[PDB]
Design an enzyme around this catalytic site. Structure first.
Site, mmCIF file in Angstrom:
data_model
loop_
_atom_site.group_PDB
_atom_site.id
_atom_site.type_symbol
_atom_site.label_atom_id
_atom_site.label_comp_id
_atom_site.label_asym_id
_atom_site.label_seq_id
_atom_site.Cartn_x
_atom_site.Cartn_y
_atom_site.Cartn_z
ATOM 1 N N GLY A 22 53.531 32.069 44.717
ATOM 2 C CA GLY A 22 53.212 31.052 43.732
ATOM 3 C C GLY A 22 53.845 31.401 42.404
ATOM 4 O O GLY A 22 54.341 32.513 42.196
ATOM 5 N N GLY A 24 53.802 29.701 37.991
ATOM 6 C CA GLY A 24 53.384 28.675 37.057
ATOM 7 C C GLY A 24 52.689 29.196 35.816
ATOM 8 O O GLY A 24 53.229 30.045 35.099
ATOM 9 N N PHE A 26 49.437 30.886 35.129
ATOM 10 C CA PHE A 26 48.933 32.255 35.074
ATOM 11 C C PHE A 26 50.045 33.276 35.278
ATOM 12 O O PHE A 26 50.011 34.360 34.684
ATOM 13 C CB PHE A 26 47.834 32.452 36.122
ATOM 14 N N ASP A 137 32.985 28.364 37.668
ATOM 15 C CA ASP A 137 34.037 27.518 38.221
ATOM 16 C C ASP A 137 34.046 27.640 39.742
ATOM 17 O O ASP A 137 35.090 27.829 40.370
ATOM 18 C CB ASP A 137 35.401 27.867 37.623
#
Length: 292
Positions: A22, A24, A26, A137
């Site tokens: 991944g 982006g 963070f 969250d």
């Protein structure tokens, strides 16, 4: 009650990045292996690399929280690496997040797995309660999948998911453990609906008066009134009338004995999901939850 957590600093000569998983906001996160030197051991890890030497702060805070917990249903921290952009080494969850998992395989998860996930997530949540830590969250996205039979909670204690929050968190910004059981109720609805968006057509602003006055999410087709009753009990406005995680473990593990009794999935008996075979890219010394 001293914290006493042990923060391990790791050598980057001890771990190798295999593939990118991944990228982006963070930062870029890699699938990789950690070889504790002199230990004759290879650990499948996930390495979260900071976006830039400025975004470190967010990493070290995450390392503080992850190191301060230890439960079979909460994500485990192995160590950090103090490179130019600091690196966050966490246990590799090969199957991704539960949200993506239930969407991709919707047609091959039976009732045993659904109810076993609910009891497992409630277990981890009951642990964060015993430690007086609030998640804030809890969603289907923040639950990672080690194996199809073992899931662990992630992204806890660090801080908008308005459709997941309890009413007191909406209007009064009040986040407690009883505000977490509300989120728990939404995630169960997420799983029972096979990865559906809660309040799909509604904008974020209208939600507060919809709940305050008395509307909730609909009944999943596969859900009997038994499992749906505890979902709505999670969505009371009075936090003390909501059930406790300790009770949710009990109630769900009960239905987890006769799973076809509480979840109607056509073809339930024919469904199944993979087992941890020896799949890898060579690696004859691999572990993870067994390194201590």
């Amino acid at each position: 009650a001293p914290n006493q957590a042990l923060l391990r600093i790791l050598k980057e000569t001890e771990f190798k990045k295999i593939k990118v998983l991944g990228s982006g906001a963070f930062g870029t996160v890699y699938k990789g292996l950690w070889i504790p030197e002199g230990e004759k051991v290879k650990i499948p890890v996930a390495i979260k690399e900071a976006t830039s030497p400025k975004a470190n702060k967010e990493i070290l805070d995450e390392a503080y929280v992850m190191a301060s917990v230890d439960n079979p249903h909460v994500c485990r921290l192995l160590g950090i690496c103090l490179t130019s952009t600091v690196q966050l080494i966490t246990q590799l969850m090969p199957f991704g997040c539960l949200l993506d998992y239930v969407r991709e395989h919707k047609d091959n998860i039976g009732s045993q797995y659904l109810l076993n996930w609910c009891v497992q997530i409630a277990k981890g949540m009951n642990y964060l309660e015993d430690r007086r830590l609030v998640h804030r969250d809890l969603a289907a996205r923040n639950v990672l999948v080690k194996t199809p039979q073992h899931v662990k909670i992630t992204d806890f204690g660090l801080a908008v998911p308005i459709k997941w929050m309890a009413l007191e968190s909406i209007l009064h910004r009040i986040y407690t453990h009883q505000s977490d059981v509300w989120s728990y109720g939404v995630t169960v609805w997420e799983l029972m609906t096979f990865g559906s968006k809660p309040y799909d057509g509604i904008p974020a602003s209208e939600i507060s008066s919809i709940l305050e006055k008395g509307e909730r999410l609909p009944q999943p087709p596969i859900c009997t009134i038994d499992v749906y009753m505890i979902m709505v009990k999670c969505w009371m406005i009075d936090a003390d009338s909501r059930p406790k995680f300790r009770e949710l473990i009990i109630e769900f593990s009960k239905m987890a004995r006769d799973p076809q009794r509480y979840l109607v999935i056509q073809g339930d008996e024919r469904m199944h999901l993979p087992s941890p075979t020896d799949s890898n890219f060579r690696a004859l010394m691999d572990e993870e939850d067994m390194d201590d």
